[PDB]
From a paper:
Given that compound 1/GRL0617 is known to inhibit [name]-[name] PLpro with an IC50 value of 0.6 μM33, we expected it would likely inhibit the [name]-[name]-2 enzyme and indeed it does so, with an IC50 value of 2.3 μM in our assay conditions. The structures of complexes with inhibitors 1, 2, and 3 were determined at 1.95–2.30 Å, including compound 3 in both wild-type and mutant forms. The S4 site is where specificity of the LXGG sequence recognition motif is determined as it recognizes leucine side chain by fitting it into hydrophobic pocket.
There are two distinctive cysteine proteases encoded by the [name]-[name]-2 genome that are essential to the virus proliferation cycle: [name] (PLpro, a domain within [name], EC 3.4.22.46) and chymotrypsin-like main protease (3CLpro or Mpro, corresponding to Nsp5, EC 3.4.22.69).
Numbering used by the authors: 2 to 314
Write the structure that this text describes.
């Protein structure tokens, strides 16, 4: 019998020693098996495999429990989707641009770069250790794993056209936003005044206007009586808010927002860039950087800082 020793894992933290038969595929012995994202199920062991760490699909209770604690999912497809993504994201370049980890353009990744740059500028704790560990590593310049996880958690494959607002929404659902509270007042002539409290993701996201200021002064929304009504912000408790609208020409003023998603072209198949407010306005287009003191352009998301706001209306 001819054997090498390897380590199997689902989380790359708990490692299990296996002795593999060199005449048999990884798949015959472990089920689905991956090396740095590369599917090696149907491959047999090379000598240069000796001692290396392979990911396996969980096939005992111990591994299912370790996978849930690391990823916060029991979805049996999750590992395979993560590894197929990583197989591309490990070949992408992650240049530092204006002190932020960006992504050189590849495989329709503009939305993932914009998301990655945004996440480095807002306060967020991820619930799954997999995402928190990879977020820290991405901050420090090694973002391949984090980008692969974003793809797996959003149910997206490499090359697929992605929306930043939807991606941030999915990531926020995997984050601790329980302390986040939003109180709204809706004012209609007929039904009158009704207050609503939102928590978590719905407390930090709004779709309809880019202007946090305009949200405060109220916006015109339909009432279920038939009338238009005024929705306005009463109380906000969150470290940030995210204001989105369909792309439209918008002026961005230095020092009045944290960062913003620029979107150019048709529905779905256009291109994202990222605008960030520093000592001046920086436009990060993957690996490319431009700066200007003023900006007018097609914006769809704006991020703002917050701690505690109460209206005076
Ligand atoms: C990039 C992408 C991937 C997947 C999906 N489903 C949507 C988008 C997308 O186009 N989003 C932008 C920001 C967008 C959003 C809302 C309304 C829009 C109307 C016209 C043009 C763009 C619009
Ligand atoms: Cl493990
Ligand atoms: Cl969970
Ligand atoms: Cl690639
Ligand atoms: Cl979670
Ligand atoms: Zn174990
Ligand atoms: Zn969870
Ligand atoms: Zn690729
Ligand atoms: Zn009414």
């Amino acid at each position: 019998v001819r054997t090498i020793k390897v380590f199997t894992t689902v989380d790359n933290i708990n490692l299990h020693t296996q002795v593999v038969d060199m005449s048999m595929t990884y798949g015959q012995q472990f089920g689905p098996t991956y090396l740095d994202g590369a599917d090696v199920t149907k491959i047999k062991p090379h000598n240069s495999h000796e001692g290396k760490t392979f990911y396996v699909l969980p096939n005992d209770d111990t591994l299912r429990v370790e996978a849930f604690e690391y990823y916060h999912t029991t979805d049996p497809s999750f590992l395979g989707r993560y590894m197929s993504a990583l197989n591309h994201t490990k070949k992408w370049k992650y240049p530092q641009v204006n002190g932020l980890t960006s992504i050189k353009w590849a495989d329709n990744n503009s939305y993932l770069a914009t998301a990655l740059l945004t996440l480095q500028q807002i306060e967020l704790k991820f619930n799954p250790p997999a995402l928190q560990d990879a977020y820290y590593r991405a901050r420090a310049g090694e973002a391949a794993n984090f980008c692969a996880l974003i793809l797996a958690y959003c149910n997206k494959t490499v090359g697929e056209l992605g929306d930043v607002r939807e991606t941030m929404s999915y990531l926020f659902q995997h984050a601790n936003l329980d302390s986040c509270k939003r109180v709204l007042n809706v004012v209609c002539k007929t039904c009158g005044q009704q207050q609503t409290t939102l928590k978590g993701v719905e407390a930090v996201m709004y779709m309809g206007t880019l202007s946090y200021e305009q949200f405060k002064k109220g916006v015109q929304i339909p009432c279920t009586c038939g009338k238009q009504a005024t929705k306005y912000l009463v109380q906000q408790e969150s470290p940030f808010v995210m204001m989105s609208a369909p792309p439209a020409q918008y002026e961005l003023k230095h020092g009045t927002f944290t960062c913003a998603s620029e979107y150019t072209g048709n529905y779905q198949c256009g291109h994202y860039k990222h605008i960030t407010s520093k000592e001046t306005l920086y436009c990060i287009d993957g690996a490319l950087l431009t700066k200007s003191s003023e900006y007018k352009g097609p914006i769809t998301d704006v991020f703002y800082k917050e701690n505690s706001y109460t209206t005076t209306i």
